[PDB]
């Protein structure tokens, strides 16, 4: 028995936490990511990269802590601890935001390790690997948003920061600078996510309300056995209910569950395509016909033009504090504002 | 045998292709009314003075909108919460200028969706089902009522209702963040957990079932033909699915009970949408999200900013620019 | 006014949810199918097809 | 050379439900993208 | 409105070509 097969035996043993071959990628990298997040939000400042407090040590709370993105002066430098910026100095590495590429790259490799774990356990158990294929949606979102978007921009600075309010900032940033609500790729993502939530709710409620009486208790949960061969709920009654209520219904359980996979994964992939567009400032910002009409006719107003004015105001009022490296000095008189506000 | 009993038997009939029921007697007229008026107004309604400042906003397709920018614009701020049916206008053109179609569509739609919920109960009762699908549908109903009724009531104007359009919806969201910081509101945070998690659990459940389907076909035909409608047997191996997922994380994180799992699937996004509907319904009374502006000060007392302060700068930009001719006074109090 | 109004709106909403839950369950329990569909006397299996 | 019949041929199917789903997908994609095509 | 001159043909073809593909495949089903 060779050493490879003996190691394969040990890694694939049935134990509380399955390791596998993929765990060699998954478990250190994820532990580097999450601990790297938990360290940063507890201890590490963004004062030299952002002019912001972002740790519990500085007085921020769970909503306001972040592992913030690096300083814009580094560009897309990978910011290794041994790299030409920190030069092995741990404290300087923390201060320049090296924890952001630490968490983002260990997270990337950890997500790769998790998908590899899905494939490995699917092969060892004996099932089809559709859980891994479904997990490609979150990988597409992570890769587009945290890697491809700042790579198209000036630096890692404009990547989302690993925090609650930092993510909120990134969200509002893409509104005011990219009009990301107006992007059909995002609108398809919203359709997919809200549709997946709808499908989750409607499928769970439909199953729980077409259950067969297979027990005597009012507690219906114990009338199910995992080794039973029969369906625990009526597909026929559910189909008749939704056909008379809604007009159409599922008649095929396999298509139901594939659709439950398909909707939010397709939403994630489409929104990722839009984010790749925003990486190069290829925005759905304007409808040029409505802009030319509004420029020549000052009675024409739509909700689209109102949103354009909203984005203009947010950009001008947010940019000096959000991009402190640019040294935007906007005097009070140049800020767009309506009457009395 | 009576005519009324025959009509009661037809209305409550399970043999109807679309179930009517007594809730349907209210839902069908209201939803048809709101649908007809919405389609006509979305195509052809003249501009509406939504802010009450004689600055009419064009919402319909024929007045230069596209599908994205088009909307049925909310009623005038001059109207406020006043009831504005067609017969209280001196002409149809005045009713159109003041945003009457919004009030007509919204009021009928809201009646229609409450009767849709009741009709869901009613058909579940006539089919011998358990009755709680309507409880799950109460979460989108609560959210629709929050944005179309409850937030206008709290703010004192239907003009503050979500417009019936795509870009009008975006305008509503952005102004709402400017005025309420809904992103920093823990109930929206539960909504987001509701929809993100609901999509996660939709994908996991669908992926686990599709992963564990019983071999009943060839690889030429679609796997969905391995299921027959009305078949008694289960079409996937729940034990294989559980044996996969309890090794993906660990054994007791995995549902071995299909009823428990389906309950969790139903309950999680319903509870999340209930919470975010209450967030919008409570921000109607201006109980806003968390304010951490200048929460951190240095030992001297100089402000040390956080991400909340940068978010607040973004909120200012929206706020000082929105409804830019409407305000005459220093505070946006409603 | 804000605290009292928000509280009671939320309370009122969740008590409507509770009304729907207990009314629906009261109807099903009085009609005898609150514990699920009986497999032998499933009502849809005796109904004609819709189309 | 002979023109022999290929045995690897298979019929293609698209059932009516799949046609309705596809037509709805095409129509809503047109609804979504038409405004951007017109710009 | 000063819309894109190719917008109408792009919209009609973007709808019509997959509509035609689906109709072709549906009508031939059962052969």
């Amino acid at each position: 028995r060779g050493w490879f097969d003996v190691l394969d035996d040990w890694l694939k043993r049935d134990r509380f936490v399955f390791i596998g071959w993929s765990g060699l990628l998954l478990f250190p990298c994820a532990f580097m990511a999450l601990g790297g997040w938990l360290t940063g939000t507890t201890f590490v400042t963004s004062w030299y990269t952002h002019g912001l407090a972002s740790s519990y040590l500085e007085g921020a709370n769970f909503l306001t802590v972040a592992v913030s993105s690096p300083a814009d002066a580094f560009g897309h430098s990978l910011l290794f601890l041994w790299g030409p910026e920190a030069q092995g100095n741990l404290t300087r590495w923390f201060q320049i935001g090296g924890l952001w590429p630490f968490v983002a790259l260990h997270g990337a490799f950890g997500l790769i390790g998790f998908m590899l774990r899905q494939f490995e356990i699917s092969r060892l158990v004996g099932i089809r690997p559709y859980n891994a294929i479904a997990f490609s949606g979150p990988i597409a979102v992570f890769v587009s948003v945290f890697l491809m978007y700042p790579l198209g921009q000036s630096s890692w600075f404009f990547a989302p920061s690993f925090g609650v309010a930092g993510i909120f900032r990134f969200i509002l940033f893409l509104q005011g600078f990219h009009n990301w609500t107006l992007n059909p790729f995002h609108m398809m993502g919203v359709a997919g996510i809200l549709g997946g939530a709808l499908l989750c709710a409607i499928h769970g409620a439909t199953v729980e309300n077409t259950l067969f009486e297979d027990g005597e208790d009012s507690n219906t949960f114990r009338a199910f056995e995992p080794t039973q061969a029969e369906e625990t709920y009526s597909m026929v009654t559910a189909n008749r209910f939704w056909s008379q209520i809604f007009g159409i219904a599922f008649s095929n359980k396999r298509w139901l569950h594939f659709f439950m996979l398909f909707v939010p994964v397709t939403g994630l992939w489409m929104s990722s395509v839009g984010i790749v567009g925003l990486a190069l400032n290829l925005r759905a910002y304007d409808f040029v016909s409505q802009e030319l009409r509004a420029a020549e006719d000052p009675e024409f107003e739509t909700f689209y033009t109102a949103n354009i004015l909203l984005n203009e105001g947010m950009r001008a009022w947010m940019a000096p504090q959000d991009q402190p490296h640019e040294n935007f000095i906007f005097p009070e008189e140049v800020l767009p504002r309506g009457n009395a506000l | 045998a009576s005519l009324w009993e025959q009509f009661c038997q037809w209305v409550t009939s399970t043999n109807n292709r679309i179930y009517v029921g007594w809730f349907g007697t209210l839902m069908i007229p209201t939803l048809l009314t709101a649908t007809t008026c919405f389609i006509i107004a979305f195509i052809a309604a003249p501009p509406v003075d939504i802010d009450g400042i004689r600055e009419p906003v064009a919402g319909s397709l024929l007045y230069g909108n596209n599908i994205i920018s088009g909307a049925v614009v909310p009623s005038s701020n001059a109207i406020g919460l006043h009831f504005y049916p067609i017969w209280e206008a001196a002409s149809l053109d005045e009713w159109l200028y003041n945003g009457g179609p919004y009030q007509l569509v919204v009021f009928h739609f809201l009646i229609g969706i409450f009767c849709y919920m009741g009709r869901q109960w009613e058909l579940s009762y006539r089919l011998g089902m358990r009755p709680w699908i309507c409880v799950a549908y109460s979460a989108p109903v609560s959210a629709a009522t929050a944005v179309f009724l409850i937030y206008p009531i709290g703010q004192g104007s239907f003009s503050d209702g979500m417009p019936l359009g795509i870009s009008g919806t975006f305008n509503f969201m952005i102004v709402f963040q400017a005025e309420h910081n809904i992103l920093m509101h823990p109930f929206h945070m539960l909504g987001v957990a509701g929809v993100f998690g609901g999509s996660l659990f939709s994908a996991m459940h669908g992926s686990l079932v599709t992963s564990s389907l019983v071999r009943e076909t060839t690889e030429v035909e679609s796997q969905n033909y391995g299921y027959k409608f009305g078949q008694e047997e289960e079409t996937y191996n729940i034990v294989a699915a559980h044996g996969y997922f309890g090794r993906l994380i660990f054994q007791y994180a995995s549902f071995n009970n299909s009823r428990s799992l389906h309950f969790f699937l139903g309950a999680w996004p319903v509870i999340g949408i209930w919470f975010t509907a209450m967030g919008v319904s409570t921000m109607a009374f201006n109980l806003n999200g968390f304010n951490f502006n200048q929460s951190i000060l240095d030992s001297q007392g100089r402000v040390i900013g956080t991400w909340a302060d940068v978010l607040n700068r973004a909120n200012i930009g929206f706020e000082v620019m929105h409804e830019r001719n409407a305000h005459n006074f220093p505070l946006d109090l409603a | 006014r804000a605290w009292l109004a928000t509280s009671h709106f939320v309370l009122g909403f969740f008590f409507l949810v509770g009304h729907l839950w207990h009314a629906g369950r009261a109807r099903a329990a009085a009609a005898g199918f609150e514990k699920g569909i009986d497999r032998e006397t499933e009502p849809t299996l005796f109904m004609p097809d819709l189309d | 050379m002979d023109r022999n019949s290929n045995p690897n041929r298979q019929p293609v199917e698209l059932n009516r439900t799949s046609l309705y789903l596809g037509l709805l997908l095409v129509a809503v994609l047109g609804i979504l993208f038409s405004s951007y095509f017109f710009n | 409105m000063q819309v894109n001159n190719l917008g109408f043909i792009a919209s009609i073809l973007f709808v019509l070509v997959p509509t035609v593909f689906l109709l072709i495949l549906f009508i031939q089903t059962g052969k």
Partner: peptide
Amino acid sequence: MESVAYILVLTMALAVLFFAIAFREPPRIE
């Protein structure tokens, strides 16, 4: 004339909804 295209795509979607409900493939137990 872009309004004609918008009306056409919305009408196509609504007509597909009508035909998908009223002339659906009927579910049959076999």
